[PDB]
Every structure is written in C-alpha cells, then in structure tokens.
C-alpha cells in the first residue's frame, strides 16, 4: 500500500513501568502507481463503474501509459482471453489521471479484480489486484420472534416450567444466506421491603460511661453496648462519627472490667459482694454479654 504509515509502540518495563512512545511515521511511495478505488460491496448483475487513478510525480516529464483491464471469469467486461481491453493515455507531470472502466459482477462472494499499466520508453510499471464483495440483492432485517415472561412458580405449576421457541417463518429470506438467531436472558431486579431506620441524629446521647455498683454499672453500660451493634448493622457511622466507635469500645471494655469486680465466687452477680445474689441480674448480664 502506498501511504504514510503511523507506527504505535508501547513498552512495558518491570522497573520503568509502561511507556507509550511517540508515533513513528514511514512514508512508502513509488513515483508511478495505480490506485483502484472499489466500493465496499456491489449489487450482483448490475453494471458498475470502477475508478483507477494513475499518478505521475515527475517535475517536468509527461508519460505515455498503456493501461489494461485484465480478463476475469467472475466479471464480464470487454476483456476476454482473445481480445484485451487496453487504452493509451497521457498523464501531465505533477498530476493524476483517472481511467474509468465498466464491469458486471457475475457471481456472489469476495471476488477478484486485477488491472495493470506500463509506460512507454521507460521500464516502470504498476499492477493493482484487489477483491471486493459481490452481495446478492436484498437488505438486513432484524425482526423479533417472541418476547415472553418466565416464572416457574407462576407458569407450568409447582416450580417447573417448559416453553418452546419456534423458528422464524422468514419466507422473504434470500436463498443460501446466513441468518443468526440472537437469544437474550435478563433477570428481574426486585428490591425494597426495607423501612427506614433511625437516622442516628438523636442517638448520639446513648454513649454513657459505666460507673457505680454492679447493677448501676450495668445501667450505664446498657445503652452503649446496644448502640454500637445498631450502628454496625445500619452502617450509620458515616453520619455518627467513626472515631466514636473506638471511643465507645473503651467504655464497653471499661464496663466489662468493672462488671467482673462485682462477681460472686460461685459465678453470680449482685450490687455488692455482700448482697445475696440476684437471679434476674445474672440472666440480664448473660443477655448483655
């Protein structure tokens, strides 16, 4: 191909990291050449025009060119094996000349087209062989077969559901052509069933320092212990303050250390060690702990 190429280079170093280099440009060129500019696709069995452009970049020399379209079994033209389709043209210097040809596509697919040209009194020549798609007449259609709901509890009864998809009837289909069937599945996103929790605005007061007797230490430790667990599961430490969970952790640890000081030697609890042990308070600490 005659153009300027742009080369992109990216390096990967285990110590110097990724580096995307500056693009390097290489201009590939010949002084005399052809560029056959085909369409991407052509309708089969309809006569079309191809445009072959021939370029002359001498600064003071016009050139006599014999240009020829070659015979093709897949494309009908004036070029046959006995009789060739050739012309004799003249290209002025620092200019380009376009030579039209007319052809007819004969068979479907990506078929071959070839042209050549050579100049008189110099031995510089060029040939261009490209392929272009011969498409049968017709157009793309993306119709929908079916759109239906799946629910095995609701449809088919008792958690089992069977459902068929017939193929498309497509009587307008072009003969011997591809036909994809795109199947898609997407679940149903169901949400909510959650009520609003308490916004933790007025819950900032329940941090109480434990103090006093064993029951009184349990009174002061009572709102501090439950509030951390509520704010853990409601994750409202963003509004409340992340520093206050560590501060409450010291008060919960201080409450437990003070709670073990009123422990009876038979693993029981009361306000004092002199007092007879309380059955209800023993059950309440087990609920708290």
């Amino acid at each position: 191909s005659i153009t300027t190429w742009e080369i992109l280079a990216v390096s990967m170093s285990d110590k110097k990291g990724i580096c995307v280099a500056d693009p390097f440009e290489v201009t590939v060129m010949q002084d005399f050449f052809i560029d056959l500019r085909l369409p991407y696709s052509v309708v089969r069995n309809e006569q079309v025009e191809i445009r072959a452009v021939l370029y002359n970049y001498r600064q003071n020399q016009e050139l006599k060119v014999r240009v020829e379209l070659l015979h093709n079994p897949a494309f009908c033209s004036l070029a046959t094996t006995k009789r060739r389709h050739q012309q004799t043209v003249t290209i002025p210097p620092k200019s380009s000349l376009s030579v039209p040809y007319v052809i007819v596509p004969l068979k479907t697919g990506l078929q071959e087209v070839e042209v050549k040209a050579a100049v008189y009194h110099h031995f510089i020549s060029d040939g261009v062989r490209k392929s272009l798609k011969v498409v049968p007449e017709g157009i793309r259609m993306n119709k929908t077969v079916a759109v239906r709901t799946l629910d095995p509890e609701r449809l088919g009864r008792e958690g089992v559901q069977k459902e068929d998809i017939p193929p498309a009837d497509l009587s307008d289909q072009v003969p011997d052509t591809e036909s994809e069937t795109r199947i898609l599945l997407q679940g149903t996103p169901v949400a909510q069933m959650t009520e609003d929790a308490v916004d933790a605005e007025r819950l900032k007061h329940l941090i109480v320092t434990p103090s006093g007797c064993g029951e009184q230490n349990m009174i002061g430790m009572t709102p501090t212990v439950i509030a951390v667990h509520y704010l853990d599961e409601t994750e409202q430490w963003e509004k409340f303050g992340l520093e206050k969970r560590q501060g409450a952790l010291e008060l919960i640890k201080k409450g437990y250390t003070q709670q073990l000081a009123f422990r009876q030697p038979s693993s029981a609890f009361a306000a004092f060690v002199k007092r007879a042990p309380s059955t209800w308070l023993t059950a309440y600490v087990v609920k708290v702990f």
Binding site: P152, L184, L185, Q186, T194
Partner: protein
C-alpha cells in the same frame, strides 16, 4: 430494630436454573440466575 436490619428482608429470591435444548443438541446450555446476576445479561448466538 437491629434484628429488623442485620439480616434485613428484601424482595430478591432468585434461584433460577434455566437450560436450553439445542437444535445441534451436542450439549445443553445451562446457566444460573441469582442476585449478583439479576441485572446481568446472558446472550447466545446461532448461525441458522
């Protein structure tokens, strides 16, 4: 209110096991749908 959250109720209960029986039928395409794939698309293409 903590036990109301923590393991809070939610409308999702997806546990779908869907399988297809192909025209080529060399294998049965089978996928699963749960909560992490609730809004996930699953697509397959044929050539016929």
């Amino acid at each position: 209110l903590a036990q109301y959250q923590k393991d809070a109720p939610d409308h999702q209960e997806l546990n779908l096991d869907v399988s297809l029986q192909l025209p080529s039928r060399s294998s049965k395409i089978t996928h699963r749908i749960h909560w992490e794939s609730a809004s996930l698309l699953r697509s397959e293409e044929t050539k016929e």
